[PDB]
PDB file of C-alpha atoms in Angstrom:
ATOM      1  CA  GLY K 242       1.793  -7.281 -12.817  1.00  0.00           C
ATOM      2  CA  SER K 243      -1.721  -8.335 -13.755  1.00  0.00           C
ATOM      3  CA  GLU K 244      -4.478  -5.767 -13.246  1.00  0.00           C
ATOM      4  CA  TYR K 245      -7.686  -6.845 -11.513  1.00  0.00           C
ATOM      5  CA  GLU K 246     -10.355  -4.591  -9.962  1.00  0.00           C
ATOM      6  CA  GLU K 247     -12.876  -6.480  -7.813  1.00  0.00           C
ATOM      7  CA  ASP K 248     -15.115  -5.027  -5.080  1.00  0.00           C
ATOM      8  CA  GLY K 249     -13.195  -1.752  -5.307  1.00  0.00           C
ATOM      9  CA  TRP K 250      -9.630  -3.064  -5.129  1.00  0.00           C
ATOM     10  CA  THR K 251      -6.456  -3.506  -7.197  1.00  0.00           C
ATOM     11  CA  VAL K 252      -5.358  -7.154  -6.966  1.00  0.00           C
ATOM     12  CA  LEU K 253      -1.926  -6.815  -8.548  1.00  0.00           C
ATOM     13  CA  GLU K 254      -0.568 -10.277  -9.356  1.00  0.00           C
ATOM     14  CA  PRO K 255       3.138 -11.195  -9.440  1.00  0.00           C
ATOM     15  CA  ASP K 256       2.765 -10.926 -13.235  1.00  0.00           C
TER      16      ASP K 256
ATOM     17  CA  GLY X1400      -6.130   8.798  14.279  1.00  0.00           C
ATOM     18  CA  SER X1401      -2.469   9.238  13.382  1.00  0.00           C
ATOM     19  CA  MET X1402      -3.413  12.200  11.126  1.00  0.00           C
ATOM     20  CA  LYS X1403      -0.928  10.967   8.499  1.00  0.00           C
ATOM     21  CA  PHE X1404      -2.719   8.796   5.914  1.00  0.00           C
ATOM     22  CA  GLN X1405      -5.903  10.142   4.343  1.00  0.00           C
ATOM     23  CA  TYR X1406      -7.594   6.736   4.044  1.00  0.00           C
ATOM     24  CA  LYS X1407      -7.866   6.561   7.842  1.00  0.00           C
ATOM     25  CA  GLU X1408      -9.616   9.954   7.895  1.00  0.00           C
ATOM     26  CA  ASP X1409     -11.993   9.336   4.968  1.00  0.00           C
ATOM     27  CA  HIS X1410     -13.405   6.056   6.336  1.00  0.00           C
ATOM     28  CA  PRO X1411     -14.424   5.099   9.888  1.00  0.00           C
ATOM     29  CA  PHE X1412     -12.440   2.551  11.860  1.00  0.00           C
ATOM     30  CA  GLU X1413     -15.438   0.208  12.099  1.00  0.00           C
ATOM     31  CA  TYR X1414     -15.744   0.038   8.309  1.00  0.00           C
ATOM     32  CA  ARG X1415     -11.975  -0.355   7.880  1.00  0.00           C
ATOM     33  CA  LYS X1416     -11.813  -3.149  10.470  1.00  0.00           C
ATOM     34  CA  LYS X1417     -14.695  -5.104   8.933  1.00  0.00           C
ATOM     35  CA  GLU X1418     -13.199  -4.504   5.479  1.00  0.00           C
ATOM     36  CA  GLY X1419      -9.867  -5.921   6.627  1.00  0.00           C
ATOM     37  CA  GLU X1420     -11.370  -8.944   8.368  1.00  0.00           C
ATOM     38  CA  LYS X1421     -13.562  -9.567   5.312  1.00  0.00           C
ATOM     39  CA  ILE X1422     -10.664  -9.429   2.844  1.00  0.00           C
ATOM     40  CA  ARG X1423      -8.434 -11.517   5.140  1.00  0.00           C
ATOM     41  CA  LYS X1424     -10.791 -14.456   5.724  1.00  0.00           C
ATOM     42  CA  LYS X1425     -11.566 -14.400   1.972  1.00  0.00           C
ATOM     43  CA  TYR X1426      -8.061 -14.105   0.437  1.00  0.00           C
ATOM     44  CA  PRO X1427      -5.657 -15.522   3.049  1.00  0.00           C
ATOM     45  CA  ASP X1428      -2.661 -15.740   0.682  1.00  0.00           C
ATOM     46  CA  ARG X1429      -2.742 -11.965   0.065  1.00  0.00           C
ATOM     47  CA  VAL X1430      -2.373  -8.805   2.144  1.00  0.00           C
ATOM     48  CA  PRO X1431      -4.299  -5.502   1.936  1.00  0.00           C
ATOM     49  CA  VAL X1432      -1.902  -2.581   1.450  1.00  0.00           C
ATOM     50  CA  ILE X1433      -3.063   1.037   1.199  1.00  0.00           C
ATOM     51  CA  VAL X1434      -0.636   3.028  -0.962  1.00  0.00           C
ATOM     52  CA  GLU X1435      -0.734   6.821  -0.693  1.00  0.00           C
ATOM     53  CA  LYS X1436       1.519   9.756  -1.494  1.00  0.00           C
ATOM     54  CA  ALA X1437       3.839  11.683   0.827  1.00  0.00           C
ATOM     55  CA  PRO X1438       2.945  15.142   2.209  1.00  0.00           C
ATOM     56  CA  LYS X1439       3.316  17.521  -0.759  1.00  0.00           C
ATOM     57  CA  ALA X1440       5.945  15.404  -2.495  1.00  0.00           C
ATOM     58  CA  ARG X1441       6.744  16.306  -6.110  1.00  0.00           C
ATOM     59  CA  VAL X1442       5.313  13.071  -7.506  1.00  0.00           C
ATOM     60  CA  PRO X1443       1.990  12.245  -9.227  1.00  0.00           C
ATOM     61  CA  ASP X1444      -0.773  11.039  -6.929  1.00  0.00           C
ATOM     62  CA  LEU X1445      -2.121   7.491  -7.148  1.00  0.00           C
ATOM     63  CA  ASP X1446      -5.909   7.524  -7.516  1.00  0.00           C
ATOM     64  CA  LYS X1447      -6.034   3.763  -6.940  1.00  0.00           C
ATOM     65  CA  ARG X1448      -5.157   3.231  -3.277  1.00  0.00           C
ATOM     66  CA  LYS X1449      -6.468  -0.190  -2.207  1.00  0.00           C
ATOM     67  CA  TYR X1450      -3.947  -2.812  -3.353  1.00  0.00           C
ATOM     68  CA  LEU X1451      -4.219  -6.549  -2.668  1.00  0.00           C
ATOM     69  CA  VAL X1452      -0.837  -8.149  -3.385  1.00  0.00           C
ATOM     70  CA  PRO X1453       0.223 -11.717  -2.487  1.00  0.00           C
ATOM     71  CA  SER X1454       1.967 -12.353   0.812  1.00  0.00           C
ATOM     72  CA  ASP X1455       5.177 -13.897  -0.546  1.00  0.00           C
ATOM     73  CA  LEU X1456       5.509 -10.985  -2.998  1.00  0.00           C
ATOM     74  CA  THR X1457       8.620  -9.007  -2.102  1.00  0.00           C
ATOM     75  CA  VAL X1458       8.952  -5.267  -1.567  1.00  0.00           C
ATOM     76  CA  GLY X1459      11.151  -5.133  -4.666  1.00  0.00           C
ATOM     77  CA  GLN X1460       8.270  -6.408  -6.781  1.00  0.00           C
ATOM     78  CA  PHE X1461       5.962  -3.930  -5.031  1.00  0.00           C
ATOM     79  CA  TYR X1462       8.221  -1.043  -6.082  1.00  0.00           C
ATOM     80  CA  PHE X1463       7.808  -2.031  -9.735  1.00  0.00           C
ATOM     81  CA  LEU X1464       4.063  -2.613  -9.348  1.00  0.00           C
ATOM     82  CA  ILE X1465       3.417   0.798  -7.792  1.00  0.00           C
ATOM     83  CA  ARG X1466       5.817   2.773 -10.001  1.00  0.00           C
ATOM     84  CA  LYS X1467       3.945   1.486 -13.060  1.00  0.00           C
ATOM     85  CA  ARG X1468       0.603   2.568 -11.581  1.00  0.00           C
ATOM     86  CA  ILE X1469       1.890   6.094 -10.907  1.00  0.00           C
ATOM     87  CA  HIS X1470       3.321   6.456 -14.442  1.00  0.00           C
ATOM     88  CA  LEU X1471       6.276   8.101 -12.720  1.00  0.00           C
ATOM     89  CA  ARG X1472       8.748  10.159 -14.716  1.00  0.00           C
ATOM     90  CA  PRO X1473      11.983   8.262 -15.475  1.00  0.00           C
ATOM     91  CA  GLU X1474      14.200  10.834 -13.734  1.00  0.00           C
ATOM     92  CA  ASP X1475      12.694  10.495 -10.251  1.00  0.00           C
ATOM     93  CA  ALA X1476      13.227   7.715  -7.716  1.00  0.00           C
ATOM     94  CA  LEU X1477      10.662   5.914  -5.565  1.00  0.00           C
ATOM     95  CA  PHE X1478      11.039   5.380  -1.811  1.00  0.00           C
ATOM     96  CA  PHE X1479       8.462   3.536   0.279  1.00  0.00           C
ATOM     97  CA  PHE X1480       7.805   4.195   3.965  1.00  0.00           C
ATOM     98  CA  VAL X1481       6.427   1.634   6.422  1.00  0.00           C
ATOM     99  CA  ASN X1482       5.953   3.548   9.690  1.00  0.00           C
ATOM    100  CA  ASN X1483       8.240   6.264   8.273  1.00  0.00           C
ATOM    101  CA  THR X1484      10.927   3.598   7.767  1.00  0.00           C
ATOM    102  CA  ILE X1485      12.155   2.615   4.300  1.00  0.00           C
ATOM    103  CA  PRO X1486      11.244  -1.087   4.281  1.00  0.00           C
ATOM    104  CA  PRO X1487      13.901  -3.684   3.430  1.00  0.00           C
ATOM    105  CA  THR X1488      13.706  -4.555  -0.257  1.00  0.00           C
ATOM    106  CA  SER X1489      14.724  -8.156   0.518  1.00  0.00           C
ATOM    107  CA  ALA X1490      11.590  -8.569   2.675  1.00  0.00           C
ATOM    108  CA  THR X1491       8.133  -9.844   1.768  1.00  0.00           C
ATOM    109  CA  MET X1492       4.880  -7.908   2.025  1.00  0.00           C
ATOM    110  CA  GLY X1493       3.537 -10.723   4.204  1.00  0.00           C
ATOM    111  CA  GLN X1494       6.281 -10.214   6.785  1.00  0.00           C
ATOM    112  CA  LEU X1495       5.844  -6.429   6.683  1.00  0.00           C
ATOM    113  CA  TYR X1496       2.069  -6.718   7.044  1.00  0.00           C
ATOM    114  CA  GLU X1497       2.563  -9.212   9.878  1.00  0.00           C
ATOM    115  CA  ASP X1498       4.787  -6.686  11.679  1.00  0.00           C
ATOM    116  CA  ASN X1499       3.239  -3.331  10.725  1.00  0.00           C
ATOM    117  CA  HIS X1500      -0.510  -3.608  10.038  1.00  0.00           C
ATOM    118  CA  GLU X1501      -2.646  -1.264  12.127  1.00  0.00           C
ATOM    119  CA  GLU X1502      -5.687  -2.166  14.230  1.00  0.00           C
ATOM    120  CA  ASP X1503      -7.859  -2.031  11.083  1.00  0.00           C
ATOM    121  CA  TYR X1504      -5.851  -4.914   9.534  1.00  0.00           C
ATOM    122  CA  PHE X1505      -4.260  -2.746   6.844  1.00  0.00           C
ATOM    123  CA  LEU X1506      -0.630  -2.097   5.918  1.00  0.00           C
ATOM    124  CA  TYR X1507      -0.064   1.577   5.096  1.00  0.00           C
ATOM    125  CA  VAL X1508       2.729   2.389   2.630  1.00  0.00           C
ATOM    126  CA  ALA X1509       3.662   5.910   1.530  1.00  0.00           C
ATOM    127  CA  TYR X1510       5.795   6.682  -1.522  1.00  0.00           C
ATOM    128  CA  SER X1511       7.982   9.702  -2.224  1.00  0.00           C
ATOM    129  CA  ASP X1512      10.681  10.850  -4.629  1.00  0.00           C
ATOM    130  CA  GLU X1513      12.935  11.577  -1.627  1.00  0.00           C
ATOM    131  CA  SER X1514      13.760   9.637   1.537  1.00  0.00           C
ATOM    132  CA  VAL X1515      11.929  11.296   4.428  1.00  0.00           C
ATOM    133  CA  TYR X1516      13.309   8.767   6.923  1.00  0.00           C
ATOM    134  CA  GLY X1517      14.916   5.340   6.728  1.00  0.00           C
ATOM    135  CA  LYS X1518      18.558   5.628   5.686  1.00  0.00           C
TER     136      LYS X1518
END
């Protein structure tokens, strides 16, 4: 459920 | 094109195709999934729409990921729609993307507090 915004995205991890 | 999702109407197909092929050859173990609301459903709208989740991540995990982003009220339910079909919870986003991504290399998922179609 990890938040991560790169290059205009939302890379939601399994955490 | 389909006049259903707004992301297809706000961005040209050429930019969406090159965005999909760029994000695919860069992050192969993940899938691009555009999450948007249902037509006038009584549910808060999700300002963040571009979501890159891992392939082996299941739809059940995706329900928890998205419901946290929406800050949905505890009384309502959340139903996803892949081609107006409630996707199997026991499936993976990589198998859904492999079987439902449009010509722009994007999986479109719509959420709603009520089942429009599926079961």
